[PDB]
């Protein structure tokens, strides 16, 4: 196929959405769509054009291949931050009818870092309160939070605790005093997936997992101190405790570390057998999957949920440590600093959700790999404080640019099953990067300084284009813009 031929199946629906017609890839059950603005459009097509003239297929082709998966409903959707990934693209949403016996679960549609995600903390501090002790604060966050490839947990944990954490999620953290009661209330799934079964997490996963529980990791993972730069939705900001520009917040991004990676890996191995036996055909081996009802599909879903709970405990630990560091620098209690959790969302998980599709409300398995749930106003499952706003959505940009808080919308619930973006996304000298941060007034403590070129803001897309695409499309609504002033990296 020539590049021009590829264009035959690509048709622009509206200002910010493209349609991927059936036939782009073989056996598509539904169409594919990708939401982008004029600036994001160029890169999608340039990547497709370069393929006509890595270990992953072009993002566009990955969206179509997921569209060929059995049991899918509605459309295979690529968000504006979409980039190529393992099987599913990072920034993709695919939902499956759980009453269809052909419907599958795909670990590639969740991701190796199971329940990678973001927690947003607010404070009653102002940028003028932090600027004088900025270096001291960053140092304190670094000393307190294990960060880096081989860092061990600070909060001591043994196998029993891990086992309880796999089953209980934030509830273990609450029970032992590391989490506040309100943290659980403002957390997606209330920090606890009930379907988790620690027996479906392997021994190797647990061995890897135990010393990393209570650690940040590396690469994209961060603890970032931010200032509210703009407020787009005053009402929503007020419900999140944010009332003025200058307010200081903390954003934490982490997942399930080695435990989750192993669980994902074990599932992929196990799924090869399931596919042959159950006659499952895929366009791409990275889309290896299992029938939801099969033992392979069920074992993975339960182990995924357990890894999910792990990640919530991990972000809870990070929060406790963060509160501790802030407390020390400012010689006050975390409560007097108003260091409450605004929200905690995943952007790597499969969820069982009720959704109207093809006229009837149905029970779907919603795969969100590199995308974020964004439930609308009046959804029964979200907390009382966000009933009128809709669900907060935490979008980290980069360490040198900006981040956003968005809210879920009814239109998002309709068009994308309440799914929006998760970040800027990857786009298609290390001392320079550090120097630039310093120029900008951004403090930083990094476990591995020579590797910061990889995490430079130039390697990601423009996050403001990504959120504005989702905003104009209507699937999530801008609420708050944040600016980093200090960041911890691995
Ligand atoms: N705020 C902030 N966001 C980041 C940083 N590094 C990566 N991100 C964002 O976090 C998102 C999550 O990454 P992912 O989970 O896809 O690997 C990325 O798409 C990227 O935009 C950082 O240092 N600070
Ligand atoms: Co991650
Ligand atoms: Co992430």
Author numbering: 3 to 55, 60 to 434, 444 to 505
What text comes from the article?
The human RtcB ligase ortholog RTCB, also referred to as HSPC117 or FAAP, is part of an essential heteropentameric tRNA ligase complex (tRNA-LC), along with the DEAD-box helicase DDX1, as well as FAM98B, CGI-99 (also known as RTRAF or hCLE), and ASHWIN (ASW). The tRNA ligase complex is an essential factor for both tRNA biogenesis and XBP1 mRNA splicing during the unfolded protein response in human cells.
To address this, we determined, at a resolution of 2.3 Å, the crystal structure of human RTCB in complex with a GMP molecule and two divalent cobalt ions bound in the active site. The structure of GMP-bound RTCB likely mimics an on-pathway, product-bound state. The GMP guanosine base makes hydrogen bonding interactions with the sidechains of Glu230RTCB, Ser409RTCB, and Lys504RTCB. The ribose 2′ and 3′ OH groups are hydrogen-bonded with backbone nitrogens of Ala430RTCB and Gly431RTCB, while the phosphate oxygen atoms interact with the sidechains of Asn226RTCB and His428RTCB. Co2+(A) is coordinated by His259RTCB, His353RTCB, Cys122RTCB, and the phosphate moiety of GMP, whereas Co2+(B) is coordinated by Asp119RTCB, Cys122RTCB, His227RTCB, and three water molecules. The RTCB structure shows that the metal ion A is tetrahedrally coordinated, instead of adopting octahedral coordination as observed in the Mn2+-bound PhRtcB structures.
